[PDB]
Design a binder for this molecule. Structure first.
Ligand code: CLA
Ligand code: CLA
Ligand code: CLA
Ligand code: CLA
Ligand code: CLA
Ligand code: CLA
Ligand code: CLA
Ligand SMILES: CCCCCCCCCCCCCCCC(=O)OC[C@H](COP(=O)(O)OC[C@@H](O)CO)OC(=O)CCCCCCCCCCCCCCC
Ligand SMILES: CC1=C(/C=C/C(C)=C/C=C/C(C)=C/C=C/C=C(C)/C=C/C=C(C)/C=C/C2=C(C)CCCC2(C)C)C(C)(C)CCC1
Ligand SMILES: CC1=C(/C=C/C(C)=C/C=C/C(C)=C/C=C/C=C(C)/C=C/C=C(C)/C=C/C2=C(C)CCCC2(C)C)C(C)(C)CCC1
Ligand SMILES: CC1=C(C/C=C(\C)CCC[C@H](C)CCC[C@H](C)CCCC(C)C)C(=O)c2ccccc2C1=O
Ligand code: SF4
Ligand code: SF4
Lengths: 80, 148, 160, 74, 739, 130, 61
């Protein structure tokens, strides 16, 4: 399964979570930004690696980073 | 002709060096990917974001520079082989006159000397050069499958 | 002479080339009629060929064993009209172009909408800058002295 | 001649590829730096833009003019 | 306040000309990077994203059609003007079989005057392979003054179409209901446009082209031929050549149409004098076509209680296997311009290819069959246009599926049921493509390896294992027997390609029976295989344009997008555009093979010269039958052999063809930089170049960015197509003009 | 006509699940609709909702989530996605805590959070042979 | 630093590293990256603004 990391540059704009096609990211409470929220990656087993999450990231060099790793039938997007 | 082909060789060397040096120095990161070292030497891309990141890894620089190395070695070997074919056949005036323009190369090296090779087997017979014509066609086929 | 070459005025193969080209043109001329425009055009071709060959012969041009003018670009002023003078001419023209482009970029770079003035050129300002490029060698060695030609550390750098 | 020149090109490309691999996975900036100042190898990453820009300029210069002379002759 | 048009919708102003990108909501803010410049041209004609109203899109399309027709009229006017002023048309008229058509002279600069060839007739210029001279002769044009007047009329028509476009966008723009009158539009395009154009052309042929060309074939010089208007004012100049005009129009109105058999014939074959189709046959053909199309125009109900409703016809065509059938197709084709473009472009390209075939098969112009460069150029050009238009139709079908397809409005209809089993279609098409490619190409490779191994009796040849195209030979036999048996009123077969006598004009073969052997079997199956693979790519693009097992929401990414990401193992080129890109490549492959087959087969087994005793000698000598069955044969006896004229063209009047040969090779190789590389490398190289510019304080305000992934692919495919087609263009033209 | 009365009125497509969603895992999405709206399947073509309970089975979580995202356009929000293993091993997936992941809910802990920016990542040469 | 001040970006992984931007607002709360800087050059993603820490910006004289 791929690896997804969140960095404290998160501004809690939720654009990553609402762009994930496989429900990998979610918004959790935080105290490091104005919005009081930070993205989390608790379901990386469903991560497919499409990187839509970091295409919607407005922070300078990203706050969500996807590191491709071992492959799985879920991560390979295999309907068969 | 030697002057012009040596400048072509210099261009090939410089461009291959440019690709390889750019890939080596930009291997640890760039503006498009300031954390490229965290993804390793060979990775597919960084995604369609930030305008598109096709062939952004250092391995892709090697992959692109292989074409330029093949082209430069092709130029070098074309020059050597045509010069020595004219020297051995005795018509060194053919190279000295026709090597200054591209059509000279295409007509007097490739088109001219490819006649014995393609007639390694014809609808009339074959020669000991038949295996070389088969390898010629085989190389063309593998080249185009690479194009695929 | 230089590199084993010989002047084209004394190169037999050069005159053979001229004679063969003229003979081909005249043979082509034979198949047309009277003072018809095709014959006039072929005659003009013959005249231009003769003039070009005569000018190349009387031009301090060195010809090889193929009867073609070879360029001596080692740097000697004797054959200075082959490379050195055209080199100076191009350097002047290209420096003019680069200088006027850089001046226009830096001039509209201090306005409210720098990007708009790059797709929609300020033709008055463009004309003002373009005709001022004749002093580009002097302007360049008056802006480099003042430190206005080179940036120092505001330029951006990648991570490593 | 053809065999050895092709092997030469392969070896050169491999040398540069393994230099890139060294940069990715073996290079340590701390070892090549003493009190902020950088050693001879670490300084190659400081003017990397200069190196790449001048390689690009030489390549464009040679390509433009070699192709120009060849096409002029054509 | 008309019910069909809106008056003064858009003000005629230059203000928006000075605001580039005003049409787009995203581009209107102004450029920030160089990507804006490329996006400006990529969205210029995408009227769907510029307005949210179908009416505005329709009006823009209508005015764009007017602009295109004005451009076409200007091009035709230029052609006629060049024929009038810079051509040897008058000299070619008096010696069609010995003067090469030329209509473009080259200025004497930088030594380029060598391009002015010895085309004959005391003229110097570039030989013309567009066949305008033969077309003008078939039109009865015997003077360059008529060409000048046709050019003037073309200029006037081009201005008229420009004014019409301006008028119908800015002064009186039609409403949506006017555009959606598909019944009225079909009625008019079928009766008025097609039928009345055929009728008017039949009238022109009968009254101008029939007498003038008959006099020309009789040997009358163009100067003593009467002016065309005299054939109308004087019923005696035409009644001598065709002694049936003496009865006037009475036989027509008295149903005694047999009297007009003098100039309305049904002969078939070719004119023995000119080698083209009998112009009496052509006039009769156009008359019949006019009547048929006028009748066909009275089909759809427009404004009276009479005719058909296309909605009622489609909705009644259901079936057990097709569910709701064609229900909803009328709404699809009356609310989506992209669906109409798909159908029209596909059928238009297919029509262009059919035209290309029927052109050389039955030469319709005088002295065009013996002008081999004209025939080869016309066939190749029309086949190329057909392939491009077919790929465009597939592209716009995919665009309709992505954008204008409504799932709710297409419940259980044909479109829905096709998407529901797209897997089966694509898998079986994949199997068919593999079967056809394996067989055709591997038979070629088996022939090649048997020849290379010295086993000549193991080939798939005529003197070996033979694959006779018996079905095509049966059809050929049926056509050569048609006159008198199935077409009892025919005097000769439709085309001598099916069989018959060798037709020669001035010792040059016009048409001749095209024998089909094992060599034609293999190349025909190659054609079928390439066409099937192109169909596979395009149909996979259309069907999987909305969703797939990889990306279940591919429709939300649009028609044109590079990917969905490196995940799922890699999701490159999943768009539908990336399928029109690959399909463009495969169309290039297929059309290149088709034109190669045509060129070699014609040169080897049709074209040539006929000796006075009747011995036929061809351009190459019949090497197609035995040497077109191996890839080495194609490489050597066709490519290497017929490329001799291109490479040896330097110093001659065909040197431009060699230069374009080399330049097209250069462009084709240039394409591979964009096709093989990726955006990240070029962006990071532009980074260092920008560093240098910033160091010299010359970095542009518009930030330079590498071409987008989709634009990189588009540039690559455009350069690839241009280079390949130009290389084949120069090769074909130089070869067929030299010999 | 159909195995269950709550299935959407779909005519079946050759784009549904395969032998994989019989021995590895299958995904089911359930939702309640006020109207029998016509919607597009993530696999094939157009299906008709039921004016009530609707249940659909798919081979991938992404297919179910694409269907759910389409449902939001119908003002349908109560859709829930489950994962079914080879036997009846049902696991609620998408509304994991009953609140959509885009809305912050108490009781969620940050997973995969690094207390630094990208520039703070360790050098790869120091991560060799671990 | 304050609103309207000109600062140099010291963050290395930044499209505006070593460049100068205009501070839009400096947050007074306990956020990690309070300084909001607006730039004239859009980055590769198209944005022209970003939040920076107090130690990642250096005010220009
Ligand atoms: C003595 C020289 C030498 C040595 C010791 C190595 C050693 C190494 N290289 Mg390296 N390399 C070399 C030369 C060398 N290379 C050269 C000359 C090049 C330029 C072409 C490269 C380019 C290169 C790249 C781009 C990469 C490496 C990598 C590696 C590492 C892993 C290798 C691997 O996984 O192999 C895998 C082996 C294969 C995939 C087999 C490939 C076989 C090829 C396709 C030829 C087989 C076809 C054959 C000709 C059939 C004929 C066809 C017939 C019809 C005629 C390893 C440390 C990789 C790495 O991760 O390094 C850390 C990596 O990414 N090298
Ligand atoms: C015939 C094909 C062809 C041509 C002409 C080029 C030309 C070029 N490539 Mg290239 N390339 C090609 C095929 C080709 N490539 C293929 C197949 C690949 C494999 C993917 C690559 C991979 C590649 C890489 C990876 C790099 C290049 C680079 C370059 C540039 C080198 C500098 C130069 O010569 O400037 C002179 C330019 C020309 C002679 C050609 C354009 C001039 C035209 C004729 C002007 C016409 C104006 C009207 C140049 C634009 C390098 C670069 O960008 O350097 C700056 C670089 O980094 N190319
Ligand atoms: C749309 C199709 C078309 C095309 C491709 C051409 C192409 C050409 N025309 Mg032409 N022409 C056209 C339409 C066209 N024309 C029409 C509609 C008319 C009637 C007004 C003419 C009237 C015309 C004349 C009278 C002449 C040409 C000439 C030429 C040639 C040189 C053009 C040149 O250098 O202009 C350069 C133009 C510019 C720099 C303006 C910018 C060139 C082959 C010339 C020629 O062949 O010389 C021997 C010439 O004398 N044309
Ligand atoms: C002088 C006459 C004139 C003037 C002032 C205008 C003014 C205007 N037109 Mg208009 N138009 C005209 C003639 C004119 N038109 C004609 C003759 C036609 C019929 C073809 C149209 C068809 C037309 C359409 C369909 C649309 C406009 C639109 C517009 C508005 C924006 C135009 C713009 O920015 O694009 C300026 C564009 C150009 C200058 C490009 C010219 C393109 C030519 C035809 C290509 C020819 C090149 C040739 C083929 C060679 C290629 C190589 C503006 C009010 C647009 C509008 O109002 O919607 C927002 C719009 O959608 N016009
Ligand atoms: C008998 C009547 C008639 C005729 C001859 C045409 C002919 C044409 N229509 Mg048309 N049309 C008609 C009725 C007719 N239409 C009706 C009733 C409707 C309403 C449903 C439409 C709606 C319509 C649309 C929406 C479009 C056309 C288009 C076209 C052109 C197709 C391009 C082509 O084949 O090039 C052949 C070209 C020629 C033969 C050149 C000569 C044609 C000239 C211009 C005569 C045109 C006849 C015109 C209707 C007379 C009106 C004059 C005006 C003062 C009232 C062609 C010129 C398309 C086009 O290209 O737009 C411009 C297009 O997009 N038509
Ligand atoms: C009747 C014909 C027709 C019409 C009306 C359209 C209309 C349209 N197409 Mg389309 N298309 C066609 C034929 C047609 N196409 C064909 C035949 C193909 C197959 C190649 C395609 C393939 C195609 C694709 C793949 C796409 C479109 C798109 C579009 C839309 C936007 C077009 C645009 O803005 O381009 C503006 C015009 C340009 C950018 C011009 C580009 C210049 C071309 C590529 C090079 C031409 C070179 C020329 C031959 C000269 C070379 C000589 C050399 C020596 C210089 C528009 C609705 C796009 C879209 O989004 O649709 C919604 C899209 O993605 N089409
Ligand atoms: C010469 C190069 C080449 C070759 C051989 C092919 C071959 C093929 N392409 Mg293509 N392709 C090419 C270049 C080429 N392409 C390029 C440059 C592009 C870029 C645009 C594409 C893009 C492309 C697309 C987009 C598609 C194809 C498809 C296909 C396949 C069609 C089905 C078929 O005939 O399979 C049969 C295989 C052959 C004819 C190859 C030769 C096989 C020999 C003759 C017979 C078997 C030999 C035997 C098994 C050897 C065993 C011994 C060995 C083990 C030692 C086929 C594999 C389609 C596909 O997937 O297939 C349906 C498809 O959709 N191609
Ligand atoms: C060819 C077969 C054919 O067209 O028969 C026609 C057959 C009859 O379908 P329908 O009776 O339902 O069509 C009635 C209306 O839809 C008219 O189109 O159509 C099919 O079943 C499609 C299956 C294609 C299978 C490809 C083999
Ligand atoms: C003339 C003459 C002479 C001289 C000579 C010389 C002096 C030479 C030199 C030469 C040289 C001097 C050469 C060199 C070359 C170089 C090279 C070829 C290099 C390459 C490089 C690379 C490949 C790199 C890699 C890398 C990287 C990339 C980074 C990391 C690390 C490494 C290193 C890995 C004499 C007197 C003797 C005599 C005769 C005359
Ligand atoms: C070449 C060309 C051109 C020209 C064209 C033309 C010249 C055309 C013409 C056309 C025409 C000139 C047409 C005409 C038409 C006519 C018609 C179409 C008529 C019809 C009629 C009818 C249909 C009638 C019927 C009837 C009635 C109704 C009543 C009585 C009886 C009857 C039956 C007789 C232009 C310059 C443009 C451009 C370029 C190309
Ligand atoms: C070179 C290259 C670039 C860089 C190319 C750029 C930036 C294009 C630059 C075009 C210049 C600025 C304008 C065109 C200049 C030409 C001389 C004009 C065309 C010639 C006319 C006769 C038409 C990419 O962005 C790219 C993206 C994806 C895959 C491959 C590639 C790729 O290979
Ligand atoms: S890849 Fe990016 S988008 Fe796709 S799931 Fe993993 S995180 Fe969400
Ligand atoms: S960039 Fe190239 S590779 Fe990376 S995802 Fe987009 S398409 Fe696939």
């Amino acid at each position: 399964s791929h690896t997804v990391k969140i960095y404290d540059t998160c501004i809690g704009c939720t654009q990553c979570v609402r762009a994930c096609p496989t429900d990998v990211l979610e918004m959790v409470p935080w105290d490091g930004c104005k919005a009081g929220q930070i993205a989390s990656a608790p379901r990386t087993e469903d991560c497919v690696g499409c990187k839509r999450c970091e295409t919607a990231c407005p922070t300078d060099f990203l706050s969500v980073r996807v590191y491709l790793g071992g492959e799985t039938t879920r991560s390979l997007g295999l309907a068969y | 002709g030697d002057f012009l082909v040596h400048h072509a060789i210099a261009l090939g060397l410089h461009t291959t060096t440019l690709i390889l040096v750019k890939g080596a120095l930009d291997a640890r990161g760039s503006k498009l990917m300031p954390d490229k070292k965290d993804f390793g030497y060979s990775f597919p891309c960084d995604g369609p974001g930030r305008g598109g990141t096709c062939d952004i890894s250092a391995w892709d620089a090697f992959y692109l520079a292989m074409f330029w190395m093949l082209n430069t070695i092709g130029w070098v070997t074309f020059y050597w082989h045509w010069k020595h074919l004219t020297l051995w056949q005795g018509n060194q005036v053919q190279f000295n006159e026709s090597s200054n323009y591209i059509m000279g190369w295409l007509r007097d090296y490739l088109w001219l000397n490819s006649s014995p090779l393609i007639n390694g087997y014809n609808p009339f017979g074959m020669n000991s050069l038949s295996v070389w014509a088969w390898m010629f066609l085989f190389g063309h086929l593998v080249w185009a499958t690479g194009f695929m | 002479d230089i590199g084993g070459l010989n002047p084209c005025k004394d190169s037999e193969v050069f005159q053979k080339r001229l004679a063969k080209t003229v003979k081909k043109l005249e043979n082509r001329l034979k198949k047309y009629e009277e003072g018809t425009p095709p014959q006039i055009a072929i005659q003009q071709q013959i005249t231009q060929t003769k003039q070009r060959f005569t000018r190349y012969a009387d031009s301090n041009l060195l010809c090889g064993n193929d009867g073609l003018p070879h360029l001596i670009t080692d740097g000697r002023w004797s054959h200075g009209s082959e490379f050195l003078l055209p080199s100076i001419l191009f350097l002047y023209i290209s420096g003019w172009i680069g200088w006027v482009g850089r001046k226009y970029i830096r001039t509209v770079g201090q306005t409210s909408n720098p990007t708009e003035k790059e797709i929609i050129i300020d033709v008055p300002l463009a004309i003002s800058i373009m005709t001022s490029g004749f002093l580009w060698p002097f302007a360049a060695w008056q802006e480099f002295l003042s430190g206005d030609l080179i940036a120092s550390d505001e330029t951006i750098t990648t991570s490593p | 001649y053809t065999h050895h020149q092709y092997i030469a090109g392969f070896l050169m490309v491999g040398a540069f590829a393994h230099g890139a691999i060294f940069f990715v996975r073996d290079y340590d900036p701390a070892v090549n730096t003493r009190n902020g100042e950088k050693n001879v190898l670490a300084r190659m990453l400081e003017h990397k833009e200069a190196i790449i820009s001048h390689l690009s300029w030489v390549s464009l210069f040679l390509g433009f003019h070699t192709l120009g002379i060849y096409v002029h002759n054509d | 306040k008309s019910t069909i048009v809106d008056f003064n919708p858009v003000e005629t102003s230059f203000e928006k000309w000075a605001k580039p990108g005003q049409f787009s909501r995203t581009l209107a803010k102004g450029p920030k990077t160089t990507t804006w410049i490329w996006n400006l041209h990529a969205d210029a004609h995408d009227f769907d994203i510029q307005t949210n109203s179908l009416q505005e899109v329709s009006r823009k399309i209508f005015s764009a059609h007017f602009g295109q027709l004005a451009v076409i009229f200007l091009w035709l006017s230029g052609m006629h003007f060049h024929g009038a002023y810079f051509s040897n048309y008058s000299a070619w008229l008096t010696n069609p079989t010995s003067t090469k058509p030329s209509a473009q002279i080259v200025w004497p600069i930088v030594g380029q005057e060598v391009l002015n060839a010895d085309v004959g007739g005391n003229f110097q210029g570039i030989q013309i392979t567009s066949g305008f001279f033969q077309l003008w002769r078939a039109e009865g044009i015997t003077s360059e003054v008529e060409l000048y007047w046709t050019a003037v009329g073309g200029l006037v028509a081009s201005f008229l179409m420009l004014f019409a476009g301006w008028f119908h966008y800015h002064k009186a723009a039609p409403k949506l209901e006017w555009f959606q009158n598909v019944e009225s539009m079909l009625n008019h395009h079928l009766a008025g446009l097609l039928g009345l154009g055929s009728l008017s052309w039949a009238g022109h042929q009968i009254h101008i082209a029939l007498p003038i060309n008959k006099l020309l074939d009789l040997g009358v010089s163009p100067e003593e031929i009467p002016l065309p208007y005299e054939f109308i004012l004087n019923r005696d100049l035409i009644a001598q050549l065709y002694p049936s005009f003496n009865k006037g129009l009475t036989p027509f109105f008295t149903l005694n149409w047999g009297e007009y058999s003098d100039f309305l014939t049904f002969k078939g074959g070719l004119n023995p004098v000119t080698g083209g189709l009998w112009l009496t046959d052509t006039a009769h053909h156009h008359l019949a076509i006019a009547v048929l199309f006028i009748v066909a125009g009275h089909m759809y109900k427009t404004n009276w209680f009479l005719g058909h409703s296309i909605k009622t016809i489609l909705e009644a065509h259901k079936g057990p296997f097709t569910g709701e059938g064609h229900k909803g197709l009328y709404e699809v084709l009356t609310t989506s311009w992209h669906a109409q473009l798909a159908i029209n472009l596909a059928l238009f390209g297919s029509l262009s290819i059919i035209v290309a075939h029927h052109m050389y098969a039955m030469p319709p112009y005088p002295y065009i069959a013996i002008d081999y460069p004209t025939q080869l150029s016309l066939f190749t050009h029309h086949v190329w246009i057909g392939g491009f238009c077919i790929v465009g139709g597939a592209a716009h079908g995919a665009i309709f599926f992505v954008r204008d397809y409504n799932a709710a409005n297409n419940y259980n209809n044909l479109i829905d049921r096709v998407i529901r089993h797209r897997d089966a279609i694509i898998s079986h098409l994949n199997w068919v493509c593999i079967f056809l490619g394996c067989h055709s190409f591997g038979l070629y490779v088996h022939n090649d390896t048997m020849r290379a191994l010295g086993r000549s009796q193991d080939l798939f040849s005529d003197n070996a294992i033979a694959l006779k195209p018996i079905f095509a030979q049966f059809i050929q036999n049926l056509h050569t027997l048609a006159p008198g048996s199935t077409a009892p009123n025919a005097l000769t077969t439709v085309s001598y390609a099916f069989g018959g006598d060798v037709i020669s004009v001035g010792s040059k073969i016009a048409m001749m029976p095209i024998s089909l052997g094992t060599a034609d079997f293999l190349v025909h199956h190659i054609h079928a295989f390439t066409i099937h693979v192109t169909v596979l790519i395009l149909l996979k693009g259309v069907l999987y344009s909305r969703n797939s097992r990889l990306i279940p929401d591919k429709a939300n990414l649009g028609f044109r997008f590079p990917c969905d990401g490196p995940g799922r193992g890699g999701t490159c080129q999943v768009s539908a555009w990336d399928h029109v890109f690959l399909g463009l490549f495969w169309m290039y492959n297929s059309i290149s093979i088709v034109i190669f087959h045509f060129s070699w087969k014609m040169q080897s087994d049709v074209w040539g010269t006929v000796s006075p005793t009747g011995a036929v000698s061809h351009i190459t000598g019949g090497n197609f039958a035995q040497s077109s069955i191996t890839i080495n044969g194609w490489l050597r006896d066709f490519l290497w052999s017929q490329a001799a004229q291109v490479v040896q063209s330097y110093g001659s009047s065909l040197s431009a063809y060699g230069l374009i040969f080399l330049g097209a090779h250069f462009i084709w190789a240039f394409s591979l930089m964009f096709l093989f590389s990726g955006r990240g490398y070029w962006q990071e190289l532009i980074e260092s170049i920008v560093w240098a510019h910033n160091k010299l304080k010359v970095a542009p305000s518009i930030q330079p960015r590498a071409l987008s992934i989709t634009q990189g692919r588009a540039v690559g495919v455009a350069h690839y197509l241009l280079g390949g087609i130009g290389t084949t263009w120069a090769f074909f033209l130089a070869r067929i003009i030299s010999v | 006509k159909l195995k269950q009365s709550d299935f959407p009125k779909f005519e079946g497509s050759t784009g549904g699940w395969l032998s994989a969603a019989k021995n590895e895992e299958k995904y089911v999405i359930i939702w309640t609709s006020k109207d029998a709206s016509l919607f597009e399947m993530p696999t094939g073509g157009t299906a008709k909702m039921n004016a009530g309970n609707n249940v659909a089975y798919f081979a991938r979580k992404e297919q179910c989530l694409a269907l759910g995202s389409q449902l939001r356009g119908f003002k349908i929000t109560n859709y829930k996605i489950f994962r079914i293993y080879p036997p009846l091993d049902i696991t609620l997936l998408h509304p994991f805590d009953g609140v959509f992941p885009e809305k912050v809910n108490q009781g969620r802990s940050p997973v995969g959070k690094r207390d630094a920016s990208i520039g703070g990542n360790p050098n790869p040469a120091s991560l060799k042979f671990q | 630093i304050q609103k309207g001040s000109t600062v140099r970006i010291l963050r290395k992984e930044s499209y505006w590293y070593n460049e100068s931007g205009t501070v839009v607002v400096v947050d007074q709360s306990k956020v990690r990256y309070p300084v909001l800087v607006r730039f004239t050059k859009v980055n590769y993603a198209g944005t022209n603004t970003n939040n920076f820490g107090l130690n990642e910006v250096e005010e220009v004289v």
